[PDB]
């Protein structure tokens, strides 16, 4: 059911606006390189914590 | 919508004439083609001369 936003357990503390790629074990992280981009957040989260994103 | 979006040699827009022959180019014998002009020259880095080559 094509979604414009995924709930996505962060692996690593995930700023607002931050581009997200896969992280160890599936969970969401930082990343600073084009192409592992998947999405970006609209949350901040910790680590562990659900993070908000929105998929590009 | 993919994960790569694998551009071509032509897509660098501001690649130069000999820079694309040689991106595209799969042998150090083809670099060589393309980077030596002078056919004497060519054929000694070749290893490769007739009696005219080694007069040059």
């Known amino acids: 059911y ?8 962060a692996g ?3 700023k607002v606006g931050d581009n997200l790629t896969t992280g160890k074990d599936g969970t969401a992280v930082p990343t600073d390189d084009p192409s592992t981009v998947f999405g970006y957040a609209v ?3 910790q680590e562990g914590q659900l993070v908000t994103l929105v998929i590009s | 919508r993919s994960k790569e979006i ?3 040699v032509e897509d660098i827009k501001d690649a130069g ?9 799969n042998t150090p014998s ?3 083609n393309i980077i030596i002009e002078n056919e004497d020259a060519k054929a000694l880095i070749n290893g490769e001369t007739t009696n005219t ?3 040059n």
């Open chain 1, 43 to 45: 949350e901040e989260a």
């Open chain 2, 17 to 25: 004439d000999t820079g694309k022959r040689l991106l595209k180019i």
């Open chain 2, 6 to 8: 694998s551009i071509e």
């Open chain 1, 2 to 9: 094509p979604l414009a936003a995924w709930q996505v357990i």
């Open chain 1, 12 to 14: 690593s503390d995930i």
């Open chain 2, 53 to 55: 080559n080694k007069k």
């Open chain 2, 30 to 32: 083809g670099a060589r």
